Amino acid sequence: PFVKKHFVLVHTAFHGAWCWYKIVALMRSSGHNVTALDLGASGINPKQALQIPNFSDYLSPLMEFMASLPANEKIILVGHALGGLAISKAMETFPEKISVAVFLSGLMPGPNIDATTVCTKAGSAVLGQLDNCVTYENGPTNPPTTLIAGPKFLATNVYHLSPIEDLALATALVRPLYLYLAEDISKEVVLSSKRYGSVKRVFIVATENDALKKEFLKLMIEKNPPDEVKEIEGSDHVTMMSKPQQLFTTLLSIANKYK
Amino acid sequence: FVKKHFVLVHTAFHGAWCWYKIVALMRSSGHNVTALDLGASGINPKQALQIPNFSDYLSPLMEFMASLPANEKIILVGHALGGLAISKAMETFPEKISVAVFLSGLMPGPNIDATTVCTKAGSAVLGQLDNCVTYENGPTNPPTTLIAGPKFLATNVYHLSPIEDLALATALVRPLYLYLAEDISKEVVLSSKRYGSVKRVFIVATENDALKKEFLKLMIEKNPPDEVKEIEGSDHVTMMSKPQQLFTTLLSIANKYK
Numbered sequence: 001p002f003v004k005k006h007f008v009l010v011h012t013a014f015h016g017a018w019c020w021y022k023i024v025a026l027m028r029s030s031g032h033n034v035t036a037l038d039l040g041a042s043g044i045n046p047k048q049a050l051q052i053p054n055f056s057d058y059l060s061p062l063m064e065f066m067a068s069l070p071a072n073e074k075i076i077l078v079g080h081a082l083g084g085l086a087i088s089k090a091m092e093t094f095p096e097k098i099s100v101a102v103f104l105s106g107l108m109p110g111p112n113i114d115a116t117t118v119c120t121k122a123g124s125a126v127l128g129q130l131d132n133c134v135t136y137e138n139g140p141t142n143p144p145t146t147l148i149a150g151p152k153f154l155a156t157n158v159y160h161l162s163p164i165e166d167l168a169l170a171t172a173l174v175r176p177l178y179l180y181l182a183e184d185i186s187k188e189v190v191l192s193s194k195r196y197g198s199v200k201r202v203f204i205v206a207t208e209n210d211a212l213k214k215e216f217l218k219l220m221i222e223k224n225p226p227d228e229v230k231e232i233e234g235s236d237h238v239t240m241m242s243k244p245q246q247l248f249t250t251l252l253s254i255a256n257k258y259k
Numbered sequence: 260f261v262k263k264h265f266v267l268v269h270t271a272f273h274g275a276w277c278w279y280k281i282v283a284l285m286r287s288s289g290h291n292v293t294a295l296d297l298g299a300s301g302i303n304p305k306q307a308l309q310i311p312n313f314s315d316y317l318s319p320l321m322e323f324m325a326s327l328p329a330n331e332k333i334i335l336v337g338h339a340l341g342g343l344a345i346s347k348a349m350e351t352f353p354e355k356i357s358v359a360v361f362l363s364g365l366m367p368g369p370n371i372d373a374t375t376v377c378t379k380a381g382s383a384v385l386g387q388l389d390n391c392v393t394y395e396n397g398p399t400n401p402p403t404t405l406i407a408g409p410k411f412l413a414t415n416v417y418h419l420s421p422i423e424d425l426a427l428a429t430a431l432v433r434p435l436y437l438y439l440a441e442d443i444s445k446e447v448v449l450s451s452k453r454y455g456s457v458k459r460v461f462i463v464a465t466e467n468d469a470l471k472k473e474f475l476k477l478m479i480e481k482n483p484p485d486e487v488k489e490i491e492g493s494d495h496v497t498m499m500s501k502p503q504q505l506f507t508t509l510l511s512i513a514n515k516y517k
């Protein structure tokens with residue numbers, strides 16, 4: 001008995017809706033509804049990084065989408081890494097519209113390990129890594145304005161287990177990420193047990209993730225326990241690129257279990 | 260093995276991203292490749308309304324061509340609408356191009372000009388299936404931009420390509436400013452001494468469109484190239500449906516016109 005479901009996919013830093021193309025295809029092909037979103041200044045979003053210094057505007061595309069969702073319609077919300085922040089806010093704001101939330105190697109802050117804590121730890125693994133660089137559109141007196149992912153950083157830390165053509169796709173598509181202030185992030189993402197915590201949650205681990213160490217990972221899982229943790233072996237950070245079929249079946253299974 | 264430099268130019272709605280399979284094959288084989296985004300294409304910062312003049316659309320390529328030291332020749336590949344862009348580049352920097360390749364591209368010449376090839380190309384897209392136009396200059400002025408619908412992409416463009424590539428494109432196609440024939444005709448002027456001096460190869464690649472193939476045959480007849488090659492089983496986006504074949508063809512062309 002087929003039950004049509006609605007998957008909503010949220011990308012990580014530098015990326016956009018385009019990174020899910022293999023997953024979007026498998027979904028639409030099986031009869032499910034899927035929405036892959038471009039966050040602020042991501043993918044083909046019209047905004048430029050410098051134009052959106054407020055974290056609020058980076059998340060607006062998902063919040064607007066969440067608000068426009070029809071009555072009584074539930075979705076399986078999936079966030080990849082940094083996208084974890086975006087969906088956490090969506091969970092806190094519209095808990096009743098989310099069947100189950102999935103954190104794919106996602107930043108999963110909780111009441112006992114706030115957003116800024118997770119953002120600082122995350123920042124350390126990206127800033128200064130290989131050829132990644134920052135800009136100073138506001139002068140040396142102020143914090144760097146944006147972060148730009150380098151091709152070597154992508155090939156080594158993110159796409160090391162993915163098809164080489166996927167690496168080429170990424171280099172031609174990744175955009176700068178405005179370096180949002182922790183203070184601003186801390187005010188936008190505030191989670192409570194009664195709302196955020198009432199949403200079924202599952203975390204997916206990428207066994208060969210070289211972008212986000214398992215140390216930091218186990219920390220979030222331990223300090224903000226999900227309803228379940230699943231693994232995907234042989235996957236690098238971008239599971240949707242390196243292990244698409246496995247991620248797809250894992251998502252259908254998760255969808256079925258929490259419907 | 261002589262290292263070479265391939266410069267790829269996309270067609271309407273697309274961007275440098277559509278060449279990802281070809282770009283991957285060239286880098287791994289040792290060659291250098293540049294996949295550019297034209298104005299308001301791919302991740303180019305401009306929005307269609309900001310580039311109402313065709314010159315604005317071509318700027319990323321003209322700009323790239325100028326930065327090239329005359330001694331570093333390239334193989335310039337233009338796809339479909341991209342044919343107009345490389346034609347302009349052929350006229351301005353003729354000596355920097357070893358050979359110019361038109362992948363089912365618009366190939367205007369002295370006998371069949373830019374406005375002619377354009378009007379024809381546009382009739383195959385405007386009003387087709389779920390495509391639509393916008394009016395940012397008011398309801399009384401001609402439409403400003405053309406947007407590619409997903410059904411049109413599935414049926415008329417990616418019909419012979421992997422389903423994921425259709426999904427990829429639906430997530431990345433951007434609007435195209437509806438340039439004026441008058442602007443285009445004035446921007447794309449070609450002369451036998453410059454444009455005509457560049458080695459030119461046309462690649463035929465289309466499958467279930469007799470009229471499309473006819474139009475393509477009309478340009479080859481009116482503006483004869485130095486050679487015509489063919490690729491079978493390709494839909495509109497050969498780089499998606501027949502990657503390995505397109506790649507092989509490009510290397511062959513490159514090794515022959517050093």
Ligand SMILES: C=CCCCCCCCCCC(C)=O
Nearest residue numbers: 012013081082119122123180
């Ligand atoms: C505190 C500054 C905000 C910037 C957030 C940096 C963290 C991004 C983590 C995701 C890494 C990736 C390649 O997906």
Ligand SMILES: C=CCCCCCCCCCC(C)=O
Nearest residue numbers: 270271339340377380381440
């Ligand atoms: C004078 C009209 C110029 C605008 C014509 C736009 C149509 C694009 C045709 C090329 C087909 C394609 C997208 O590959």
